[PDB]
């Protein structure tokens, strides 16, 4: 099926350069360095960043309140009202997980720390859309930082900066079912030619999942005549999906992204980031014209249902002194992030 130049335009505007469209001139491997860092999606059902990810240790929220002179009870309540358990007051009230058995959305009874009853919240609700761009744009916290008597773990800082990105306006280049021609062209140009990366939805199911991409590799390119492709993949004597298509190329490629973890420390500088890098193969026919330029594509081999819904890039970090509606100052968080990365 033919390729829409609408999404390519958005990219060409942002990068200030034309996209490479000739398949033979595209790179077959592109890795983004440094890798985006691993971190959790700070689920809503666990009360966002109010969660004690470390046993016995105060939450990242509580640590932020203590350090920067805010009331713990009210700051954590603010976190919960916007992003945590209290943000779902309208959902079915519960005391145990037995109560939520009526629903069919994947709910789990969610009770705040100190409280006795809560609400039935789906466990996938979170801030993956906020962590992903932070993983890319923000240098990973490496080692602990003490500020006003409280120690912030690299993981605590990952929590704080993630919620900042949720609360702040982050400018995006949003693009996207998704044409495999576009997928290949975007992935090869951004990861390969432009020393950059993006955020992808890798589920293609009901729920939305955001992961920062680490790399893209082409594992196979196999030229095919229109007649060869049509028979092999559709059982047809002629290729129906694009009148303008002159020849075909079967491509098998792998996208590589970072997944969630609560593991503390600077995972990227450790080389430990490899443990939290996963991926998926994608199979597609690319449509070529006479000049060997990609003009379209078709998904094959069950990548028909299982392919990324959209691709987006964060244009830049949030503005220097932004304060979230939860009371989270990006100025305060940036200060701690700089010390964590430089190890002071």
CA separation for the pair 263, 87 (Å, rounded): 27
Tokens representing 92 are: 């079915």
Query: Exposed e or buried b for every residue in 145-183, given b needs 16+ CB within 10 A?
Result: bebeebebbbbbbbbbbbbbbbbbebeebebbebbbbbb
Domains annotated on the chain, with CATH? 1-43+126-344 (no CATH), 44-125 (3.30.40.240)
Tokens representing 66 are: 């203590």
Tokens representing 237 are: 């004597």
Residue ranges of the alpha helices (H) in the chain?
A: 5-15, 60-67, 72-82, 128-137, 154-167, 180-187, 226-234, 267-270, 330-342
Cβ partners under 8 Å of residue 12, min gap 6: 18, 19
Other C-beta atoms closer than 10 Å to the C-beta of 334 total 18
Closest C-alpha among 140, 201, 132, 197 to residue 166 = 132
Inter-residue contact 30 to 190 (CB < 8 Å): yes
With tokens 């469209």, the residue in question is 21
Tokens representing 22 are: 């000739």
Q: What beta strand segments (E) does the chain contain?
A: 29-31, 93-94, 107-110, 118-122, 145-147, 150-152, 172-175, 199-201, 210-224, 247-258, 277-288, 294-299, 311-314
Cβ partners under 8 Å of residue 171, min gap 6: 314, 315, 316
Inter-residue contact 22 to 241 (CB < 8 Å): no
* DSSP structural state of residue 293: B
Method: X-ray
* DSSP structural state of residue 318: P
């Amino acid at each position: 099926e033919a390729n829409g130049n609408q999404d390519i335009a958005k990219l060409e505007a942002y990068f200030g350069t034309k996209m490479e469209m000739t398949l033979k001139d595209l790179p077959t491997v592109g890795v983004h360095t440094p890798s985006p860092w691993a971190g959790p999606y700070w689920p809503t059902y666990q009360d966002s960043i109010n969660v004690q990810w470390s046993q016995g240790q105060p939450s990242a929220a509580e640590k932020y309140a203590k350090a920067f002179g805010k009331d713990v009870k009210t700051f954590m309540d603010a976190v919960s009202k916007k992003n945590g358990i209290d943000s779902q007051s309208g959902r079915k009230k519960c005391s145990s997980d037995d109560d939520c058995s009526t629903l069919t959305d994947g709910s789990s009874c969610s009770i705040r720390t100190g409280k006795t009853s809560g609400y039935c919240i789906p466990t996938w609700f979170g801030i993956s859309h906020a962590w992903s761009p932070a993983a890319i744009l923000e240098t990973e916290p490496k080692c602990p930082v003490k500020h006003n008597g409280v120690t912030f773990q690299p993981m605590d800082l990952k929590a704080l900066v993630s919620l900042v990105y949720d609360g702040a306006r982050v400018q995006t280049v949003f693009t996207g079912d998704l044409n495999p021609a576009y997928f290949h062209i975007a992935s090869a140009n951004i990861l390969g030619k432009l020393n950059s990366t993006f955020v992808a939805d890798v589920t293609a199911g009901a729920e939305v999942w955001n992961q920062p991409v680490r790399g893209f590799k082409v594992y196979e390119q196999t030229e095919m005549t229109l007649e060869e492709g049509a028979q092999t993949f559709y059982g047809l004597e002629a290729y129906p999906w694009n009148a303008a298509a002159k020849s075909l190329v079967y491509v098998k490629s792998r996208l590589s992204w970072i997944y969630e973890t609560y593991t503390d420390g600077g995972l990227v500088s450790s080389g430990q980031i490899d443990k939290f890098t996963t991926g998926q193969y994608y199979y597609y026919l690319l449509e070529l014209d006479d000049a060997g330029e990609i003009i379209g594509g078709e998904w094959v081999y069950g990548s028909d249902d299982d392919h990324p819904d959209f691709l987006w890039l964060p244009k830049a970090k949030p503005a220097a002194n932004t304060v979230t509606s939860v009371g989270l100052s990006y100025a305060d968080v940036s200060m701690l992030l700089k010390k964590s990365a430089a190890c002071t």
